[PDB]
């Protein structure tokens, strides 16, 4: 029943702000946004290519009421300071010709659409590192089997998307 642990070994505080950084420093910086396709503002969730950037502060909220996050629980992830055209700060997974992608929405969202993430601890590490799972509807329910990874588009944006191989890994650094 381990609760999530941050980069300094302390429990992640529900609703608190954290920087989602890669385990391997060489993989880039924190998570932020980019404007792609026909988007009116930055509604595409991406990983900063700047290794010194901590990216945007992210709020992690649980499906359960608690001061902490029970790692086996579903979580919603949102930017503490979302772009202007986003209706709310929460990330969602949207279908596309290229496959499911992590985005921000112009629409108000129902809990079932944002409470679709789950952190999965990686065993081979001295600190607490987590892969990020996406959990689609197992209909009245939901199931966490599909991982989140990176896809660099033609312009160099490192978009967070559902991937088959090579899931990203993260450490949660309290802002």
Nearest residue to Ni ion on Cβ basis: 23
Site for Ni ion contains 131 (CB under 5 A): no
Q: Which residue has the tokens 């629409």?
A: 107
CA separation for the pair 170, 150 (Å, rounded)? 12
Torsion angle, alpha carbons of 61, 158, 21, 131, to 10: 60
CA separation for the pair 4, 67 (Å, rounded)? 11
Residue 81 or 123: the one with the smaller Cβ distance to Ni ion is 123
Residue 23 or 151: the one with the smaller Cβ distance to Ni ion is 23
How many residues at the interface with Ni ion, by CB under 5 A?
2
Residue 13 CB, shortest distance to Ni ion, in Å, is 24
Torsion angle, alpha carbons of 138, 140, 141, 145, to 10: 10
Interface residue with Ni ion, options 149, 169, 170, 171 (CB under 5 A): 169
Nearest residue to 77 via CA among 124, 26, 30, 145: 30
Dihedrals phi, psi of 5, to nearest 5 degrees: -120, 135
Q: Any bridge partners for residue 171, and if so which?
A: 21
Residue 7, number of CB atoms within 10 A of its CB: 17
Stretch near Ni ion under the rule CB under 5 A, chosen from 60-68, 138-146, 151-159, 163-171: 163-171
Residue 86 CB, shortest distance to Ni ion, in Å, is 30
Residue 86 or 148: the one with the smaller Cβ distance to Ni ion is 148
Stretch near Ni ion under the rule CB under 5 A, chosen from 41-49, 74-82, 148-156, 166-174: 166-174
| Subset of 6-65 contacting Ni ion (CB under 5 A) | 23
Residue 22 CB, shortest distance to Ni ion, in Å, is 8
Binding site residues, Ni ion, CB under 5 A: 23, 169
């Amino acid at each position: 029943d381990d609760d999530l642990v941050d980069a300094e070994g302390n429990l992640v505080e529900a609703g608190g702000t954290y920087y989602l950084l890669p385990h391997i420093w060489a993989h880039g910086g924190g998570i932020e946004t980019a404007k792609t396709g026909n988007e009116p503002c930055p509604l595409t969730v991406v990983r900063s290519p700047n290794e010194v950037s901590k990216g945007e502060p992210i709020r992690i909220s649980s499906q359960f009421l608690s001061l902490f996050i029970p790692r086996g629980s579903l979580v919603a992830l949102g930017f503490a300071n979302p772009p202007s055209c986003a209706a709310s700060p929460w990330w969602t997974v949207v279908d596309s010709p290229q496959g499911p992608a992590v985005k921000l929405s112009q629409q108000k969202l129902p809990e079932k659409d944002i409470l679709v993430f789950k952190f999965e601890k990686v065993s081979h590490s001295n600190i607490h590192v987590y892969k990020l799972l996406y959990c689609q509807h197992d209909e009245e329910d939901v199931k966490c089997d599909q991982y989140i990874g990176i896809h660099r588009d033609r312009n160099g944006n490192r978009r967070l998307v559902v991937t088959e191989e090579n899931p990203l890994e993260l450490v949660l650094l309290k802002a």
